[PDB]
Amino acid sequence: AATREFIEMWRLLGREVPEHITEEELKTLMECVSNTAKKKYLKYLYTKEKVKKARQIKKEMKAAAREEAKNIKKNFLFLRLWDRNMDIAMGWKGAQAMQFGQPLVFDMAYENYMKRKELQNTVSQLLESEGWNRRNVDPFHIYFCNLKIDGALHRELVKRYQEKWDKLLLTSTEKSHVDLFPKDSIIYLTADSPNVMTTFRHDKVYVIGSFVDKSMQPGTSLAKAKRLNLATECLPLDKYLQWEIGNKNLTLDQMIRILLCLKNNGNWQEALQFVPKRKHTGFL
Amino acid sequence: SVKGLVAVITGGASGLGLATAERLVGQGASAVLLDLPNSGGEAQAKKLGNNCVFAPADVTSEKDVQTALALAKGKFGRVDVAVNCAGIAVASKTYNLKKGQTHTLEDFQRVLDVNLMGTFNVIRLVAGEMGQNEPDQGGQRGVIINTASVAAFEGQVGQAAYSASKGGIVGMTLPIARDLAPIGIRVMTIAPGLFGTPLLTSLPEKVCNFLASQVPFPSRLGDPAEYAHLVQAIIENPFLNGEVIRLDGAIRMQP
Amino acid sequence: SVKGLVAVITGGASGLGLATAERLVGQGASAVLLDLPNSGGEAQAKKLGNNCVFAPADVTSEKDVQTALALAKGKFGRVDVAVNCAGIAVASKTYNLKKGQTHTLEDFQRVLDVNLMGTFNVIRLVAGEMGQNEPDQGGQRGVIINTASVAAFEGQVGQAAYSASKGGIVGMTLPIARDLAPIGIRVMTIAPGLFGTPLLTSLPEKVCNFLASQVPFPSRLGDPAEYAHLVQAIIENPFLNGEVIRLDGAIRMQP
Amino acid sequence: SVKGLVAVITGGASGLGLATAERLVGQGASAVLLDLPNSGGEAQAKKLGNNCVFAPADVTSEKDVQTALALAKGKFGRVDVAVNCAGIAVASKTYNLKKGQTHTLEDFQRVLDVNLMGTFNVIRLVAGEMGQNEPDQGGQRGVIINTASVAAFEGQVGQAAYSASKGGIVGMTLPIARDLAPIGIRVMTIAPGLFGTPLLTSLPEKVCNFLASQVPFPSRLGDPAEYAHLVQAIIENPFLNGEVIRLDGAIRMQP
């Protein structure tokens, strides 16, 4: 198209532009309908390759330092197979969790409210969240609900996980959480909820919205829990923490770690350690 | 050789029992499918041919098994082999502190009645039928093969009832073999691992796939035909008695 | 140490259960004798002093055990140890060709109900009681000790029912230990050999002397105090879990 | 099916090994008789026909086994099955107080070297040979079958050395199966009891004849062909792995 030549002049002005831009990145530049929108995307591409180059340069340096060290230069009970063994042990715990674990629902019904960038970050947070659950002493039985098979969220999940996706010990379904669990057992977590959570209940199914709203959309999560008459709760952030700055909507990885701590008989002081320290001045 | 032998196969309408029936009938034996009226055993018996009949019975019932053995004797004249493959399981923890949930006594009782009491009920009645047989040249009147599980040795979380029932089958294998030794009835037990049966298919697919991947070799669910092959080997080998054979691909079940 | 611990001992009015109560009470523990109303447990509890109470219950019934555990909680405030020593036996061959006699299903069921189902009934209910305990310094909330038999491994002629029940206890020891591991309840099983329990001391002297002579060393019937000593060792040792300990003087039972 | 398979049979000039060779060759397999130079294996190999060759070797020697496996590869092109049937026994008490006699260390060492170390020596070397095989449809590269004894579980008086060696074979069966699972080599162990081998006939006639009556059923010494039959069953069944099968007619050895 004309965009291939159009970007060329932008480089000459030194507007923080990457040297190499792949064709699939040019297609994403089509979505940028404004000068500012393009500027933010190029700045993203610039910083992406710059940290790639910086880490790569540190890789040849690391590789060179390793080979020089080796050139200069017993009874065991176990072979060193720990990473493999730990993965196997987690799988057994995961298998047990899918049969007896407490359900935790990640509601994937927020694709329409998220742009490309936000959807990417949602999957990153989901990857981290699942990892913390997998390694836990008492994992949740994670449910991915309202996950459309052909949707962008599903496609990105498959891309990040590759062949691991079919082997993840979680339940991913197109069906809603209301179709899988009794409505009285469902508690929809949202910071906008009027009801402040006091205790972690083991007989309840907590629902977390898979929704990274950098462009903040308050009440979207609460509205979903009111369209279908579901109970809502919010974290007692004000009750326990002297809040200073920042959004009170925490990330997915922070939420699951808070819930995991609470499920394992941790108190609110231990659980709220996963709230970013930059957002408060301590436990009141 | 199993040619001409008559086998009463408990739970023979599906899973391990059906695979045992198909193999034995294919090898020239006669089979009686002992299973519940709703099991669909009539269709399986018709499919296997004239050397297979369906005997509707509940193994927990003395009268039901007596009727089935009378049917077996009426059609084929004798009983040479009994294979106990009927079994149920529950997935229930003994006690869950977080949920405040206790394993039901009725759930434990139901599993024992079918798996353990049902097996013994068949054993004690088929032994009487086998006792009427004239001994062969080796002095043998019959072979009884029971189905335990690897859960009898490493039962998982939630498998207390199943493990108790299967551990009971393992426990009574040698005494019953000793009981029936004077009259020439061999008693053997197979402890299958993870097999492609409805008992395992009911689990979530992802759980089934992970468990199958954890079988050292071959890394797959057991094929029911493989169980049937071992059953035939036990029948043919006169010196296997009072033993439990693990058929599990070397798996050891974790919690 | 067992000082200050509260133990619920099923079948505690006689035999292994009584010896366990006498030792634990002598070592400073509190005992609840859970036995049948006609067992004479009231006299034994009175003999053992103020730190022992009699709780009439049938282990096979949920209501009776619940009442007994409520009595234990009311009297002593908590339950730390459960010792399952309640049990019966039958002597009956699976099938006797000469006499044309078949083991009754009722006899098999009765032994299973008391030995196996009764044990599980106590386990599942006491686990809920021990679950209410605050974990100790080692994270432990309780210890459950079951009584299997050597018959679970080499059951004699006529011991099919007993071997099945005891094989069931052995089978479910590990899964229940796995079930209760997050709660911090250790589950252990003792498999005693020939002990000088009232059942064996009432057996004919001809059989009794021979069986005592068949123990490699010491060549005598097991003293119930020796069972009690092992029970205490299990309670005191925090790392014994999910295991069956044979207490038999190295005997291996003949047919 | 074993047709076309190549089996290396240790101790194949007599006893269990020879019977295994006769069966497998009769079923269309090729056998390599690995036995001592003075064992008379050359005559046996000639008797079994063109599909059988004699490879003189001492299993305790790495070089001897390497030469034998090279002979097997040269003659038949591959190795699919290894059957470890070489073994020795010694009758010696650990300590005799009356005679003031102590078990010699060298007697214990010699039994371990042949039975236990010799088995491992063959396993570790044949695994390399089987590793060169292309996996079959089921991913299998070979099958290794070891011969333990019932002495691994109920060792008699004077069988300390033998029981240790056979207990070692049982102990390492699972780890080796786990070791070779990625390669697709199944590892199985047979634990025979009281077979009509020349070893058992070397005992006094009165003792062996009494031992025959001590087998519950059939009340006779094990036929070596019955061992061979089980070996074939293990080879044919893809899902038998990491397990010990007792082939003993339900006997449990007394002191």
Add this chain to the structure above:
Amino acid sequence: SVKGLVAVITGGASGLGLATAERLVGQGASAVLLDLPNSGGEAQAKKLGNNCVFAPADVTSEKDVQTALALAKGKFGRVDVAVNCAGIAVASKTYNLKKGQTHTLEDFQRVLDVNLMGTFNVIRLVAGEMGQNEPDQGGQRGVIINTASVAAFEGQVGQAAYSASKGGIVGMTLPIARDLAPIGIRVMTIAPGLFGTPLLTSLPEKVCNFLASQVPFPSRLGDPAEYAHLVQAIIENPFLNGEVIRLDGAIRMQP
């Protein structure tokens, strides 16, 4: 009671042997630390006081053990208890197809020599020493306690040599108990799981944390004092004989 008893503790300079020595000496027994000269056995014996002496010996050597036992008799007058805790562990796969690496025969041999042959060497020589004791009121002349491993039952990848040696100890426990039963020497075996011995505690903290989490309950490495406690329980209990006790917190090792 262990007061006044003399214990010969093999491998007593560290780990399970040292913990056993500390407990027994603390309970009023006399201990002889039998360990290699290069071990800090002399310092440990001096630390434990006048009731503990260091006897440098290699368990694989008949002469070394004879010298150590003579030292025990000279210092304390008799031997009442033998605890075999000396051992080595190697990790080596049987065969590695990708690397083309085969388990060394020498690696297998050296593990057997120390773990299995060394244990038997001590047993056969201490039995002679214990045979000279006057029997107690119970007819007992001594107690021998061996250390197997859970690897005897579920050996992991790379544990073939270790599992064989430990499986050999398990195998010979009953026959030796039967051998020494007329003499009145009890033979018992402990199969520890994961214990916080220096060999395990030297691992990276990431590995130590993972191993602790693998134990169902308590979710920690075994304390060597817990092993010592079980040793004392075995010594005090006259009816424990010919048995293997798993001390493992209900763990079952994965491949």
Add this chain to the structure above:
RNA sequence: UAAAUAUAGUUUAAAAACAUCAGAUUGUGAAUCUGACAACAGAGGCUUACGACCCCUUAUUUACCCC
């Protein structure tokens, strides 16, 4: 209404460190290797550009509630 503020895994600094995901049968620095991810609240602009500056939205905190 006003003023400061706002790091979407975390923190530090004005780009790193720690983390995350996939692969690994690791001989005990795997203490590694190969990949994946890379967005300082959001939108729109200005400017040679800047994280600068100018606007609007949302959110947080502290004051203040009608002139």
